[PDB]
């Protein structure tokens, strides 16, 4: 017998299994299609989630009821210290897939990079990359590197660079890890010879996020979702609850199959792990590319709001702290909790729509406290509402 009435199935079958991610780091599975006409450039960057806020701006959109008016849009702040490039890898194409040719190392690596190869770095001999350093610049060392670079030129189709983040510069108290996060970034544009030239120039040097993305562009966000543990079918899949009178419980699926086939099928909802999955979530628009507060104190100052303030809210980002580095501001939400490392990628979908080509001009950035109902923008506003307090008077009296 058919169903009495029709309604669509719950959930998406293209995100199976709902199992825990193999790694915590966000990783780009695919990279944008290479265009040989453009100049060589990098395609991704690594950032850390550092809380949320909202802004005000004027929208330019002819034919819309909101044209030439102000709107309020929530945003996400992500800290972006510069990355360091340490390696070059080349790939060749075979009838069975892509295979790595080799690797060229930078001969000078930091302690935080070599921490990634140990589980107890302090109580260890710390011998990683020691023999390569003693051999790289010798006469046999230069010949060996020239041999590998020749194989890159002759029989490669893809060039990538090995880069790691700098966790020493990101002086965060709640991020406990001291070993760098390492990933691969593809170089797009130009020929193979030109791609290798850019990679060699960017060896041992730092790469800033302003050189990879522009202010009013879009990007993709590879990240790992917040975890929820073992959860039931109502929260995991979104099925309806049963009537109050049900014996043995309500938060269940009543029928998990028919008599035939004589088994449970993979399309029926069951309880299990929820959250901590990898997602991609394309088309997030960049609203601002900031700089470190040590060099540019007025981060949140706007042409329409001349107050001198930084991007950090009053009392700090809850659970994270201060933003002491460069940052990016993205429109909307981002997967994962605070302190997690996130990969931003240049887009795959076409970027010719009017929404994606709009130019953004901010007008106001909110910096009130996120604890409680914040109602002051700066610390001077609070000290102007209240006059001198009891503790201020005592300090002055002691000063006398």
């Amino acid at each position: 017998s058919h169903c009495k009435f029709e309604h669509p199935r719950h959930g998406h079958l293209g995100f199976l299994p709902r199992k825990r991610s193999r790694q915590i780091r966000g990783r780009a599975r695919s990279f944008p299609k290479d265009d040989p006409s453009q100049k060589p450039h990098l395609t991704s960057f690594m950032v850390y989630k550092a809380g949320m806020t909202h802004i005000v701006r004027d929208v330019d959109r002819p034919g819309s009821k909101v044209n030439k008016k102000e709107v309020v849009e929530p945003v996400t702040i992500l800290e972006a210290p510069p990355m360091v490039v340490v390696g070059i890898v080349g790939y060749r194409q075979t009838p069975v897939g892509h295979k790595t040719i080799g690797t060229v190392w930078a001969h000078h690596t930091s302690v935080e990079f070599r921490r990634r190869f140990y589980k107890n770095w302090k109580q260890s001999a710390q011998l990683a990359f020691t023999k390569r350093k003693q051999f790289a610049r010798t006469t046999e060392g230069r010949l060996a590197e020239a041999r590998t670079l020749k194989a890159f030129e002759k029989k490669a189709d893809i060039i990538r660079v090995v880069a790691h983040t700098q966790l020493r510069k990101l002086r965060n108290n709640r991020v406990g890890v001291k070993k760098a996060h390492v990933s691969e970034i593809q170089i797009n544009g130009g020929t193979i010879a030109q791609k290798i030239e850019l990679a060699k120039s960017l060896l041992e040097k730092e790469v800033r996020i302003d050189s990879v993305f522009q202010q009013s562009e879009a990007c993709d966000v590879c990240a790992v979702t917040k975890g929820h543990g073992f959860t039931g079918v109502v929260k995991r899949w979104g099925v309806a609850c049963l009537p109050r009178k049900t014996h043995r419980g309500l938060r269940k699926v009543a029928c998990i199959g028919a008599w035939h086939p004589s088994r449970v099928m993979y399309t029926v909802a069951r309880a299990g792990q929820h959250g901590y999955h990898h997602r991609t979530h394309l088309n997030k628009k960049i609203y601002q590319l900031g700089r470190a507060v040590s060099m540019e104190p007025n981060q949140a100052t706007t042409a329409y709001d001349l107050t001198a303030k930084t991007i950090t809210p009053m009392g700090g980002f809850v659970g994270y702290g201060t933003v002491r580095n460069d940052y990016v501001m993205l429109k909307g939400s981002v997967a994962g909790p605070r302190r997690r490392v996130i990969t931003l990628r240049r887009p795959m979908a076409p970027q010719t729509s009017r929404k994606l080509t709009e130019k953004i001009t901010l007008k106001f950035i909110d910096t009130s406290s996120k604890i409680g109902h914040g109602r002051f923008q700066t610390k001077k506003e609070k000290s102007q509402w209240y006059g001198p307090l009891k503790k201020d008077r005592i300090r002055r009296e002691e000063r006398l």
Binding site: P95, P261, R263, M265, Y266
Partner: protein
């Protein structure tokens, strides 16, 4: 494959350097799929080691539309309750040949599993097979003794594309590179081939007068 330290150490003590088993390399260009698979499967059961190359040049009788529809019917079959257990639909031409041969073997006994282990089935002619030796053909399945001229036929590579195979451009790029390298090398050493030919000639008039007559009697000189 991948000799461990146990294997390399034993070879070092014994003094062995290299070894190559007796293998037949078959060029599968312009061969009927079903007839070649049946001949090869019987030879595998008789204790032979066979490597087949250029699996993308196998031919099937009928039009491309007819054969593409036949594959799409096979692709429709899957275990409804758990498709990851169901039949697996391989897409490369070399995988299709191995599946066809497997269905002509007893595959649920150790004897048949061992026989299937002796077939390699490359696509194109890889670099590790080029210089091994001369290739062979199967005259009973050569498609110029098998098909009438006016009948339409399908090339396996073209049919494997359009149903999921995504390495047609890679295979044709590598094959063209091989032809140029092999053609350049073969034009070289034309001097030594001519010199040997000019050596067998004029060897006569240097041999004794009786051995030349025996050669003439048997049609060798």
């Amino acid at each position: 494959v991948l000799p461990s330290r146990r294997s390399l150490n034993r070879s070092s003590r014994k003094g062995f350097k290299k070894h190559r088993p007796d293998i037949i390399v078959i060029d599968l260009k312009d061969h009927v799929l079903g007839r070649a698979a049946a001949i090869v499967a019987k030879q595998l059961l008789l204790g032979k080691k066979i490597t087949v190359v250029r699996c993308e040049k196998l031919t099937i009788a009928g039009s491309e539309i007819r054969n593409k529809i036949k594959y799409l019917q096979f692709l429709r079959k899957r275990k409804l309750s758990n498709p990851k257990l169901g039949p697996f639909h391989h897409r490369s031409p070399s995988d299709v040949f191995i599946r066809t041969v497997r269905s002509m073997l007893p595959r649920y006994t150790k004897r048949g599993q061992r026989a299937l282990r002796q077939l390699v089935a490359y696509e194109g002619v890889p670099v590790n097979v080029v210089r091994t030796g001369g290739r062979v053909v199967i005259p009973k399945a050569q498609r110029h003794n098998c098909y009438r001229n006016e009948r339409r036929f399908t090339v396996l590579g073209n049919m494997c594309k359009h149903v999921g195979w995504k390495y047609s451009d890679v295979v044709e790029k590598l094959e063209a590179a091989r032809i140029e390298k092999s053609g350049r090398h073969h034009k070289k050493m034309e001097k030594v081939r001519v010199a040997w030919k000019n050596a067998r000639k004029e060897a006569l008039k240097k041999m004794p007068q009786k051995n030349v007559e025996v050669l003439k009697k048997f049609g060798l000189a």
